[PDB]
Amino acid sequence: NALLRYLLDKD
Amino acid sequence: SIPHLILELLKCEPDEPQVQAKIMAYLQQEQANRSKHEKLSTFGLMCKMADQTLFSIVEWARSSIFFRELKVDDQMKLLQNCWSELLILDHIYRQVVHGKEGSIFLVTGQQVDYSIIASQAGATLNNLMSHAQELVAKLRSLQFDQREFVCLKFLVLFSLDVKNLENFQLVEGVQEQVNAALLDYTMCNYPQQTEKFGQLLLRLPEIRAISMQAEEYLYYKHLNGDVPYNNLLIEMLHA
Ligand SMILES: C=C(c1ccccc1)[C@@]12CC[C@H](OS(N)(=O)=O)[C@@H]1CC(CCCCCC)=C2c1ccccc1
């Protein structure tokens, strides 16, 4: 789940 | 009195008016961009609305005490386990606070008549919404309040059902300490309601059941070609 990872990591 | 731990959970709650305004504004834009013959199904609108609610749930979790101590892989596994429970719990609590008989209050601040919704939602979703409404009435009769609500949020998020965590001890610890805090809070603030603690905890399996059945239904609707494609809702379903 790249999208979920992105939402947790994005600055 | 309020246990210190519950105060820390309260600090992490999002500003609800801003969350709801943001979602309302997003959906207004999407409607505006759609032309006459690009009508969007009522089911499809609810999918978009639930999708935007998930974005706010993720950002809430991301900034919350304890959760922010986990590595991203652990964070992903927790949210993948409980995302639908948090949607349903958020829905339930909104009806407890703002619900009127015969109407449903959406995350946008909209009030919609149940007769309108029930005409459109189909048997399965009508059944699941009725089960959820039975929890609403139960929780309203128990005087379910915000301190208890945030406890259940964290008990849902930090589930012992999640496997393969690097730091399962934190999840176990939070689950235990939130339980003790809730047990303490209900005893101090509702001393005459012996049954309140148990009745609250008993809603979590029921919410779990409603939410998991709702996921299975939505997966069916996606496989059937009914869900507006590419968004966070679909990603959570498949993962
Ligand atoms: C899981 C849901 C869902 C429903 C339809 C499509 C996709 C998802 C919910 C959970 C709470 C979200 O409400 S919302 N959008 O945040 O205001 C959703 C909206 C809702 C009630 C109205 C549905 C009418 C359909 C024409 C949902 C729900 C589903 C089952 C039991 C209780 C609530």
mmCIF file of C-alpha atoms and ligand atoms in Angstrom:
data_model
loop_
_atom_site.group_PDB
_atom_site.id
_atom_site.type_symbol
_atom_site.label_atom_id
_atom_site.label_comp_id
_atom_site.label_asym_id
_atom_site.label_seq_id
_atom_site.Cartn_x
_atom_site.Cartn_y
_atom_site.Cartn_z
ATOM 1 C CA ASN A 1 0.000 0.000 0.000
ATOM 2 C CA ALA A 2 2.228 2.794 -1.299
ATOM 3 C CA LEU A 3 -0.480 5.415 -0.752
ATOM 4 C CA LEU A 4 -0.834 4.636 2.959
ATOM 5 C CA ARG A 5 2.949 4.654 3.383
ATOM 6 C CA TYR A 6 3.081 8.022 1.610
ATOM 7 C CA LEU A 7 0.415 9.565 3.853
ATOM 8 C CA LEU A 8 2.365 8.429 6.922
ATOM 9 C CA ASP A 9 5.739 9.684 5.634
ATOM 10 C CA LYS A 10 4.968 12.836 3.637
ATOM 11 C CA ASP A 11 6.341 16.074 5.073
ATOM 12 C CA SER B 1 -11.631 13.514 37.759
ATOM 13 C CA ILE B 2 -9.906 12.462 34.530
ATOM 14 C CA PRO B 3 -6.889 10.098 34.411
ATOM 15 C CA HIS B 4 -3.831 11.780 32.930
ATOM 16 C CA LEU B 5 -3.694 9.211 30.126
ATOM 17 C CA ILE B 6 -7.185 10.085 28.876
ATOM 18 C CA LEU B 7 -6.217 13.761 28.864
ATOM 19 C CA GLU B 8 -3.305 12.852 26.583
ATOM 20 C CA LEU B 9 -5.697 11.052 24.235
ATOM 21 C CA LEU B 10 -8.029 14.069 24.213
ATOM 22 C CA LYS B 11 -5.126 16.339 23.222
ATOM 23 C CA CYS B 12 -4.724 14.287 20.033
ATOM 24 C CA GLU B 13 -8.311 14.714 18.817
ATOM 25 C CA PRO B 14 -8.657 16.629 15.527
ATOM 26 C CA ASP B 15 -10.583 19.883 15.260
ATOM 27 C CA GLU B 16 -13.873 18.450 14.014
ATOM 28 C CA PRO B 17 -15.324 21.603 12.385
ATOM 29 C CA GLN B 18 -12.195 21.992 10.258
ATOM 30 C CA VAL B 19 -12.164 18.306 9.297
ATOM 31 C CA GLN B 20 -15.827 18.466 8.285
ATOM 32 C CA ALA B 21 -15.494 21.784 6.440
ATOM 33 C CA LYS B 22 -12.519 20.432 4.486
ATOM 34 C CA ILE B 23 -14.439 17.319 3.421
ATOM 35 C CA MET B 24 -17.536 19.368 2.569
ATOM 36 C CA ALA B 25 -15.435 21.670 0.387
ATOM 37 C CA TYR B 26 -13.711 18.773 -1.389
ATOM 38 C CA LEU B 27 -17.005 17.137 -2.353
ATOM 39 C CA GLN B 28 -18.494 20.433 -3.550
ATOM 40 C CA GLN B 29 -15.589 20.821 -5.983
ATOM 41 C CA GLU B 30 -16.016 17.289 -7.346
ATOM 42 C CA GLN B 31 -19.727 17.884 -7.963
ATOM 43 C CA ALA B 32 -18.956 21.169 -9.726
ATOM 44 C CA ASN B 33 -16.520 19.439 -12.082
ATOM 45 C CA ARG B 34 -19.116 16.833 -13.113
ATOM 46 C CA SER B 35 -21.353 17.624 -16.080
ATOM 47 C CA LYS B 36 -25.076 16.920 -16.506
ATOM 48 C CA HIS B 37 -24.591 13.404 -17.890
ATOM 49 C CA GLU B 38 -21.845 12.472 -15.413
ATOM 50 C CA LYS B 39 -24.288 11.828 -12.573
ATOM 51 C CA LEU B 40 -22.602 10.129 -9.630
ATOM 52 C CA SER B 41 -24.450 7.398 -7.764
ATOM 53 C CA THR B 42 -25.502 8.056 -4.178
ATOM 54 C CA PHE B 43 -23.423 5.012 -3.248
ATOM 55 C CA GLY B 44 -20.522 6.546 -5.161
ATOM 56 C CA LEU B 45 -20.868 9.818 -3.264
ATOM 57 C CA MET B 46 -20.712 7.962 0.055
ATOM 58 C CA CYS B 47 -17.574 6.154 -1.126
ATOM 59 C CA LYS B 48 -15.923 9.502 -1.876
ATOM 60 C CA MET B 49 -17.071 10.862 1.488
ATOM 61 C CA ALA B 50 -15.754 7.798 3.322
ATOM 62 C CA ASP B 51 -12.537 8.091 1.304
ATOM 63 C CA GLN B 52 -11.951 11.652 2.514
ATOM 64 C CA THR B 53 -12.785 10.617 6.082
ATOM 65 C CA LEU B 54 -10.024 8.008 5.836
ATOM 66 C CA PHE B 55 -7.471 10.687 4.931
ATOM 67 C CA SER B 56 -8.305 12.551 8.141
ATOM 68 C CA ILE B 57 -8.240 9.330 10.172
ATOM 69 C CA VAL B 58 -4.738 8.590 8.870
ATOM 70 C CA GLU B 59 -3.448 12.059 9.727
ATOM 71 C CA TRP B 60 -5.084 11.835 13.155
ATOM 72 C CA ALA B 61 -3.352 8.531 13.894
ATOM 73 C CA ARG B 62 -0.065 9.821 12.477
ATOM 74 C CA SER B 63 0.078 12.615 15.072
ATOM 75 C CA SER B 64 -1.343 10.659 18.011
ATOM 76 C CA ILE B 65 0.556 9.739 21.180
ATOM 77 C CA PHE B 66 2.049 6.209 21.108
ATOM 78 C CA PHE B 67 1.137 5.662 17.447
ATOM 79 C CA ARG B 68 3.795 8.174 16.385
ATOM 80 C CA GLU B 69 6.406 6.079 18.230
ATOM 81 C CA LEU B 70 5.849 3.122 15.890
ATOM 82 C CA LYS B 71 7.833 2.517 12.736
ATOM 83 C CA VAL B 72 5.894 3.105 9.535
ATOM 84 C CA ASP B 73 5.582 -0.616 8.818
ATOM 85 C CA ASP B 74 3.917 -1.147 12.201
ATOM 86 C CA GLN B 75 1.741 1.932 11.686
ATOM 87 C CA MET B 76 0.559 0.571 8.332
ATOM 88 C CA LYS B 77 -0.367 -2.814 9.808
ATOM 89 C CA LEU B 78 -2.422 -1.227 12.599
ATOM 90 C CA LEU B 79 -4.382 1.042 10.262
ATOM 91 C CA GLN B 80 -4.908 -1.764 7.740
ATOM 92 C CA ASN B 81 -6.495 -3.815 10.536
ATOM 93 C CA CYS B 82 -8.866 -1.181 11.956
ATOM 94 C CA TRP B 83 -9.596 1.416 9.257
ATOM 95 C CA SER B 84 -13.202 0.314 8.746
ATOM 96 C CA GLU B 85 -13.822 0.073 12.501
ATOM 97 C CA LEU B 86 -12.708 3.689 12.955
ATOM 98 C CA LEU B 87 -15.028 4.839 10.160
ATOM 99 C CA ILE B 88 -17.980 3.021 11.738
ATOM 100 C CA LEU B 89 -17.095 4.187 15.249
ATOM 101 C CA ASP B 90 -16.811 7.760 13.981
ATOM 102 C CA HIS B 91 -20.194 7.345 12.285
ATOM 103 C CA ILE B 92 -21.773 5.913 15.443
ATOM 104 C CA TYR B 93 -20.455 8.665 17.705
ATOM 105 C CA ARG B 94 -21.640 11.368 15.303
ATOM 106 C CA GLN B 95 -25.196 10.018 15.545
ATOM 107 C CA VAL B 96 -24.950 9.781 19.341
ATOM 108 C CA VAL B 97 -23.983 13.453 19.552
ATOM 109 C CA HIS B 98 -26.004 14.963 16.698
ATOM 110 C CA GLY B 99 -28.448 12.254 15.632
ATOM 111 C CA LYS B 100 -32.188 12.829 15.459
ATOM 112 C CA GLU B 101 -34.756 10.082 14.963
ATOM 113 C CA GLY B 102 -35.307 9.363 11.279
ATOM 114 C CA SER B 103 -32.189 11.158 10.006
ATOM 115 C CA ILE B 104 -28.486 10.468 9.500
ATOM 116 C CA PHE B 105 -25.744 13.050 10.055
ATOM 117 C CA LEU B 106 -22.850 12.808 7.609
ATOM 118 C CA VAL B 107 -19.238 13.846 8.154
ATOM 119 C CA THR B 108 -19.942 16.935 6.019
ATOM 120 C CA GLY B 109 -22.428 18.283 8.557
ATOM 121 C CA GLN B 110 -25.306 17.281 6.272
ATOM 122 C CA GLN B 111 -28.515 15.837 7.709
ATOM 123 C CA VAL B 112 -30.285 13.302 5.481
ATOM 124 C CA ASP B 113 -33.587 11.505 6.030
ATOM 125 C CA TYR B 114 -33.312 7.761 6.567
ATOM 126 C CA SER B 115 -36.271 7.101 4.263
ATOM 127 C CA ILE B 116 -34.254 8.723 1.467
ATOM 128 C CA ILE B 117 -31.098 6.751 2.287
ATOM 129 C CA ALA B 118 -32.897 3.455 2.895
ATOM 130 C CA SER B 119 -34.564 3.759 -0.513
ATOM 131 C CA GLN B 120 -31.134 3.838 -2.173
ATOM 132 C CA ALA B 121 -28.705 1.846 -0.026
ATOM 133 C CA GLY B 122 -29.979 -1.696 -0.633
ATOM 134 C CA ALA B 123 -30.728 -4.508 1.779
ATOM 135 C CA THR B 124 -27.175 -5.248 2.946
ATOM 136 C CA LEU B 125 -26.242 -1.650 3.768
ATOM 137 C CA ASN B 126 -29.689 -1.044 5.272
ATOM 138 C CA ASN B 127 -29.104 -4.056 7.529
ATOM 139 C CA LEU B 128 -25.643 -2.873 8.587
ATOM 140 C CA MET B 129 -26.872 0.684 9.158
ATOM 141 C CA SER B 130 -29.741 -0.650 11.283
ATOM 142 C CA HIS B 131 -27.291 -2.685 13.372
ATOM 143 C CA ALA B 132 -25.178 0.457 13.768
ATOM 144 C CA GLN B 133 -28.257 2.450 14.774
ATOM 145 C CA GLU B 134 -28.999 -0.111 17.492
ATOM 146 C CA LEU B 135 -25.534 0.608 18.903
ATOM 147 C CA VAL B 136 -26.301 4.345 18.710
ATOM 148 C CA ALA B 137 -29.437 3.999 20.836
ATOM 149 C CA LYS B 138 -27.592 1.722 23.263
ATOM 150 C CA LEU B 139 -24.693 4.164 23.608
ATOM 151 C CA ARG B 140 -27.039 7.141 23.967
ATOM 152 C CA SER B 141 -28.888 5.402 26.808
ATOM 153 C CA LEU B 142 -25.526 4.803 28.516
ATOM 154 C CA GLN B 143 -24.591 8.514 28.256
ATOM 155 C CA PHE B 144 -21.585 7.715 26.065
ATOM 156 C CA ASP B 145 -19.301 10.772 26.231
ATOM 157 C CA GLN B 146 -16.179 12.072 24.512
ATOM 158 C CA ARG B 147 -13.683 10.739 27.065
ATOM 159 C CA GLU B 148 -15.054 7.227 26.588
ATOM 160 C CA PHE B 149 -15.148 7.753 22.815
ATOM 161 C CA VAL B 150 -11.435 8.548 22.538
ATOM 162 C CA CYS B 151 -10.638 5.517 24.697
ATOM 163 C CA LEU B 152 -12.530 3.219 22.324
ATOM 164 C CA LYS B 153 -10.791 4.878 19.370
ATOM 165 C CA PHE B 154 -7.431 3.901 20.844
ATOM 166 C CA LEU B 155 -8.639 0.423 21.837
ATOM 167 C CA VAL B 156 -9.746 -0.062 18.222
ATOM 168 C CA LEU B 157 -6.506 1.337 16.802
ATOM 169 C CA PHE B 158 -4.211 -0.628 19.141
ATOM 170 C CA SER B 159 -5.748 -4.035 18.512
ATOM 171 C CA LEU B 160 -4.256 -7.266 19.829
ATOM 172 C CA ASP B 161 -5.517 -8.947 16.631
ATOM 173 C CA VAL B 162 -2.683 -7.382 14.602
ATOM 174 C CA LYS B 163 0.030 -9.906 13.733
ATOM 175 C CA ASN B 164 3.693 -9.545 12.755
ATOM 176 C CA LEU B 165 4.391 -6.268 14.574
ATOM 177 C CA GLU B 166 7.972 -5.331 15.399
ATOM 178 C CA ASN B 167 6.785 -3.663 18.608
ATOM 179 C CA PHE B 168 3.801 -5.737 19.736
ATOM 180 C CA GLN B 169 4.634 -4.841 23.344
ATOM 181 C CA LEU B 170 3.637 -1.200 22.826
ATOM 182 C CA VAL B 171 0.298 -2.240 21.317
ATOM 183 C CA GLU B 172 -0.241 -4.601 24.244
ATOM 184 C CA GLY B 173 0.771 -1.874 26.690
ATOM 185 C CA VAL B 174 -1.496 0.811 25.230
ATOM 186 C CA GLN B 175 -4.407 -1.638 25.092
ATOM 187 C CA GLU B 176 -3.860 -2.475 28.763
ATOM 188 C CA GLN B 177 -3.357 1.073 30.050
ATOM 189 C CA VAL B 178 -6.272 2.523 28.083
ATOM 190 C CA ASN B 179 -8.450 -0.261 29.503
ATOM 191 C CA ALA B 180 -7.361 0.578 33.054
ATOM 192 C CA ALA B 181 -7.925 4.279 32.360
ATOM 193 C CA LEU B 182 -11.425 3.655 30.993
ATOM 194 C CA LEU B 183 -12.226 1.384 33.940
ATOM 195 C CA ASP B 184 -11.034 4.161 36.255
ATOM 196 C CA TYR B 185 -12.844 6.943 34.393
ATOM 197 C CA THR B 186 -16.231 5.207 34.303
ATOM 198 C CA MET B 187 -15.987 4.293 37.994
ATOM 199 C CA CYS B 188 -15.268 7.882 39.050
ATOM 200 C CA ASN B 189 -17.637 9.769 36.733
ATOM 201 C CA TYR B 190 -20.555 7.286 36.491
ATOM 202 C CA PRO B 191 -20.351 5.532 39.871
ATOM 203 C CA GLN B 192 -23.979 4.359 39.753
ATOM 204 C CA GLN B 193 -23.704 2.699 36.309
ATOM 205 C CA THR B 194 -22.019 -0.588 37.190
ATOM 206 C CA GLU B 195 -22.731 -1.942 33.703
ATOM 207 C CA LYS B 196 -21.207 0.955 31.755
ATOM 208 C CA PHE B 197 -17.656 -0.384 31.406
ATOM 209 C CA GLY B 198 -18.776 -3.799 30.169
ATOM 210 C CA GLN B 199 -21.467 -2.389 27.892
ATOM 211 C CA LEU B 200 -18.872 -0.135 26.247
ATOM 212 C CA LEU B 201 -16.349 -2.941 25.734
ATOM 213 C CA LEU B 202 -19.093 -5.200 24.363
ATOM 214 C CA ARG B 203 -19.719 -2.702 21.551
ATOM 215 C CA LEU B 204 -16.216 -3.263 20.151
ATOM 216 C CA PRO B 205 -16.858 -6.836 18.907
ATOM 217 C CA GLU B 206 -20.164 -5.584 17.492
ATOM 218 C CA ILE B 207 -18.456 -2.651 15.756
ATOM 219 C CA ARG B 208 -15.782 -5.072 14.547
ATOM 220 C CA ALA B 209 -18.528 -7.305 13.141
ATOM 221 C CA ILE B 210 -20.367 -4.447 11.422
ATOM 222 C CA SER B 211 -17.139 -2.981 10.032
ATOM 223 C CA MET B 212 -15.740 -6.271 8.718
ATOM 224 C CA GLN B 213 -19.066 -7.127 7.071
ATOM 225 C CA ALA B 214 -19.099 -3.616 5.600
ATOM 226 C CA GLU B 215 -15.606 -4.142 4.175
ATOM 227 C CA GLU B 216 -16.688 -7.447 2.623
ATOM 228 C CA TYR B 217 -19.726 -5.756 1.073
ATOM 229 C CA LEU B 218 -17.663 -2.895 -0.354
ATOM 230 C CA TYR B 219 -15.119 -5.349 -1.761
ATOM 231 C CA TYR B 220 -18.062 -7.021 -3.504
ATOM 232 C CA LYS B 221 -19.219 -3.658 -4.853
ATOM 233 C CA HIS B 222 -15.696 -2.943 -6.112
ATOM 234 C CA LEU B 223 -15.398 -6.334 -7.816
ATOM 235 C CA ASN B 224 -18.841 -5.599 -9.287
ATOM 236 C CA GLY B 225 -17.631 -2.342 -10.861
ATOM 237 C CA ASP B 226 -19.562 0.056 -8.619
ATOM 238 C CA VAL B 227 -16.879 1.934 -6.645
ATOM 239 C CA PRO B 228 -15.368 5.189 -7.965
ATOM 240 C CA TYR B 229 -11.879 3.920 -8.719
ATOM 241 C CA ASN B 230 -8.383 4.921 -7.557
ATOM 242 C CA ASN B 231 -8.521 6.343 -4.051
ATOM 243 C CA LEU B 232 -7.493 5.497 -0.502
ATOM 244 C CA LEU B 233 -10.702 3.534 0.075
ATOM 245 C CA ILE B 234 -9.786 1.005 -2.615
ATOM 246 C CA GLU B 235 -6.195 0.697 -1.368
ATOM 247 C CA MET B 236 -7.361 -0.159 2.155
ATOM 248 C CA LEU B 237 -9.813 -2.750 0.810
ATOM 249 C CA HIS B 238 -7.176 -4.689 -1.129
ATOM 250 C CA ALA B 239 -4.353 -4.498 1.424
HETATM 251 C C1 LIG C 1 -18.718 2.341 5.459
HETATM 252 C C2 LIG C 1 -19.491 3.323 4.988
HETATM 253 C C3 LIG C 1 -19.730 3.386 3.491
HETATM 254 C C4 LIG C 1 -21.016 3.416 2.926
HETATM 255 C C5 LIG C 1 -21.254 3.481 1.549
HETATM 256 C C6 LIG C 1 -20.201 3.526 0.644
HETATM 257 C C7 LIG C 1 -18.911 3.505 1.168
HETATM 258 C C8 LIG C 1 -18.688 3.441 2.546
HETATM 259 C C9 LIG C 1 -20.128 4.326 6.007
HETATM 260 C C10 LIG C 1 -19.308 4.464 7.299
HETATM 261 C C11 LIG C 1 -19.418 5.915 7.754
HETATM 262 C C12 LIG C 1 -19.376 6.733 6.465
HETATM 263 O O1 LIG C 1 -19.925 8.013 6.611
HETATM 264 S S1 LIG C 1 -19.293 9.434 6.169
HETATM 265 N N1 LIG C 1 -19.134 9.334 4.553
HETATM 266 O O2 LIG C 1 -18.016 9.384 6.777
HETATM 267 O O3 LIG C 1 -20.171 10.468 6.497
HETATM 268 C C13 LIG C 1 -20.080 5.792 5.422
HETATM 269 C C14 LIG C 1 -21.527 6.205 5.118
HETATM 270 C C15 LIG C 1 -22.362 5.227 5.888
HETATM 271 C C16 LIG C 1 -23.850 5.548 6.010
HETATM 272 C C17 LIG C 1 -24.617 6.026 4.734
HETATM 273 C C18 LIG C 1 -24.601 5.050 3.521
HETATM 274 C C19 LIG C 1 -25.709 5.249 2.449
HETATM 275 C C20 LIG C 1 -25.434 4.597 1.065
HETATM 276 C C21 LIG C 1 -26.255 5.156 -0.100
HETATM 277 C C22 LIG C 1 -21.634 4.111 6.233
HETATM 278 C C23 LIG C 1 -22.156 2.960 7.066
HETATM 279 C C24 LIG C 1 -22.162 1.650 6.598
HETATM 280 C C25 LIG C 1 -22.628 0.576 7.358
HETATM 281 C C26 LIG C 1 -23.115 0.761 8.648
HETATM 282 C C27 LIG C 1 -23.109 2.064 9.135
HETATM 283 C C28 LIG C 1 -22.638 3.137 8.370
#
